[PDB]
């Protein structure tokens, strides 16, 4: 839907979490496709080493494709998995650090002192407010959620997935009120029972260090205004910088991958040069063929017709349907168990049946 | 080697990071061992489908063990990876949050106001200290490093890998000094030029909410001591609680795994019942054998002597040394390329050579 550059700590937290979740989903995806290919290759290997000579030859070209696809997926999972294990940690820490920053900017309250016993005096009942940073744990409410500034875009469209230059500061306020009128305490002490002195601290996600501004607020008797001090915290920013760099590394690695989706459709095998090269090797008069196609395309189509029907129309009937009829065995204590290759998914059992078949000859 | 229960935010931050790294390194080792077994199995498959009749039979039992080892390592990698995908992010978040808590507890400084122009008056030169929470980014210094409270023990010996209870509080200090003597401001205002009012905030990792204690410090004229307010922040603690649960779930899954190290030593194959069962299947007169040993142990030993020398003493010479001499080919553009099975490590090339071999018969 809408994915826009994050502005607030809460927005950047969700965005960095979404990024990490995206990369993990792509990785899970490549691993599932890898498993699908090796599952196919094992079944084809049982077919390619069986005693059905017609099925034996028909299994070899699809086996070459399944093995290439498997290996490629495996290499791609390794590449993506390597990027993930070197960078996703920095994303997890970034989301947490941004979330804690959001906590800090929402803290409020103050401390207030009222004069007691005399002008400018402080006694046992002088603390009239003390809720500074009393907080209840809540989840950060996303700001402008309709604008989707919390949503992540894996393509980095318009280069928008950038982090703000955070620089957390403590903004300290001091407000002296002489009481009675609205004036400060420049010319009068805090009046007994009415004079007030208020302290607060707010954390801001971005700011600049700066000394107190009492020169413009307490230099004369006038309406009371808080004097502000801004001190650089130098927390959280560096974790968010590292996270930005890491998300950029991950984005580039994960923006593309060549792992192919496992399939039994003939049209997906004909797409493969390994398939066609092996068909010529297995069925033509040149067992040493290295070409992906024949000089006359009709020659290849003839080899395909005899093996899988014209234009591969009998691909399922001649290959997968015959593989389903096989009954290789695995050990089962003192006896054996016949595998049903149409539904068997345990590579341990398939590997065992293949070994037992090769030892049966 | 020395690992103890963590006590400070900095210690617990390092312990949680060590945990995450340990689990990732164990998962990486499982993936390495899986890759070693499938590499071995592919080479044994080339031997088991080659034209050397003696090598063909000698490869099958080791192939059965290799495929079982690979499938078991794949299952354990899946078990460990599922646990890691569900929990390591919480460890990463815990380490960062504890590190940020370490930052917060190190923040010091204060705001100081000095009376100017008269007793209890505040003018443009009244802010005489303003360094509250000025901080430069530094790495947290591990406290009591010789105790090893920052080190993680993956065995959880004596149940020590427990996180402390965290409950961060803001402890606010307010100190009034009348000036002249050491007394507070109960009976006198801040004296001109000498009376001071000091305000500070410290974050503590553990604490309890408590209202101001002016009733015991500002109730009479006496030596000045700061009045304290303690307010509960309800930040960070929940992340650490969730990280502790996550670490316990990961510990249980990662404390053991059955993925075997790939090996070419006969002594590692003789440990496998699959290996011995397949030997009897391939070399005895019972092609349908399902027992892992013969009734007379000497019978199995005679089968081993025939294939791999007495007690496997010729295992390398009859198996691996023979695989090193095979020269199966892969496609190399318009021609071919012979693989050296002793050094080849690309599963794409080995799979292709296997498929070409099977299509060559
Ligand atoms: C405030 O919060 C911020 C975060 O918001 C904190 O910044 C973070 O600080 C982390 C350390 O406190 C830092 O992580 C460290 O980064 C360095 C450099 O990348 C890295 O070397 C560290 O890795 C060690 O520690 C982890 C566990 O924490 C181990 O898994 C790892 O193997 C390393 O262990 C080695 O060093 C440790 C000491 O740091 C030893 O305890 C440990 O035994 C081991 O020692 C051997 O190797 C040493 C190095 O070769 C060697 O000297 C020694 O003799 C041994 O042979 C670790 O990952 C974060 O990167 C950082 N975050 C950012 C974004 O900056 C900050 O600390 C907080 N500050 C305050 C004041 O509270
Ligand atoms: C102060 O700082 C604290 C941390 O120190 C922070 O607390 C954390 O809040 C965030 C949200 O702000 C929490 O993350 C969310 O958690 C909920 C609940 O998940 C829990 O349980 C599930 C299982 O059901 C676990 O998997 C999970 O680990 C938690 O234990 C999740 O439902 C949220 O999911 C969204 O996460 C990503 C976006 O960030 C997406 O990848 C994911 O698909 C989810 O998105 C969905 O919901 C979004 C809105 O929530 C929506 O925009 C999407 O479109 C989509 O529908 C999320 O993971 C985190 O657990 C809290 N940590 C702790 C320890 O409590 C406070 O928020 C902050 N407080 C302030 C500033 O007030
Ligand atoms: C989508 O595409 C955009 C466009 O490329 C990407 O935006 C870039 O994102 C990266 C990482 O977030 C940014 O890199 C960071 O830049 C910071 C600013 O650098 C400027 O200013 C410094 C001085 O302040 C100069 O020295 C420097 O030359 C620049 O002029 C740096 O401060 C960062 O480095 C610091 O932190 C890292 C992290 O620990 C340290 O390793 C460094 O040593 C250093 O301390 C960092 O390099 C980059 O600036 C962004 N480009 C633009 C144009 O803004 C998005 O990241 C991308 N999104 C995704 C998801 O891919
Ligand atoms: C090494 O072995 C030790 C001993 O088994 C393990 O210690 C356990 O660690 C777990 C996980 O950290 C602890 O579980 C957590 O306990 C918190 C407090 O529990 C105690 O105090 C409460 C008082 O409120 C008592 O009722 C209770 O009996 C305990 O004595 C809970 O607050 C946690 O639950 C909360 O947070 C989680 C996280 O989000 C939520 O899911 C929950 O709903 C809840 O809000 C949590 O249950 C456990 O207490 C420890 N056991 C003991 C006996 O100390 C180590 O974890 C282990 N180390 C490793 C690395 O494996």
Numbering used by the authors:
A (entry chain D), B (entry chain A): 43 to 403
Paper text:
Long-term immune evasion by the African trypanosome is achieved through repetitive cycles of surface protein replacement with antigenically distinct versions of the dense Variant Surface Glycoprotein (VSG) coat. The mature VSG proteins are attached to the cell surface by a GPI-anchor, and consist of two main regions: (1) a large, N-terminal domain (NTD) of roughly 300–400 amino acids that is most distal to the membrane and (2) a smaller, membrane-proximal C-terminal domain (CTD) spanning 80–120 amino acids beneath the NTD that harbors the GPI-anchor. Therefore, at the heart of antigenic variation in the African trypanosome are the NTDs of the VSGs. These large subdomains are elongated folds centered on a three-helix bundle scaffold.
The structure of the VSG558 NTD was determined to 1.74 Å resolution. It has a highly similar structure to VSG13 with a 2.54 Å RMSD over 324 residues. A notable difference with all the previously solved VSG NTD structures published is the presence of two N-linked glycans at the middle lobe of the VSG558 protein. To date, all VSG structures determined have been characterized by a single N-linked glycan (or none, as seen in the case of ILTat1.24). The structure of VSG558 confirms the presence of multiple N-linked glycans for another VSG. This shows that not only are the locations of the N-linked glycans variable (found in both the bottom and middle lobes), but that the number of possible such carbohydrates is also variable. Finally, as noted in the Methods, the structures of VSG21, VSG545, VSG558, and VSG615 were solved by molecular replacement using an AlphaFold model of these VSGs as search models, indicating a very close fit of the model to the experimental data (a general idea for X-ray phasing implemented by several groups due to the accuracy of AlphaFold models).
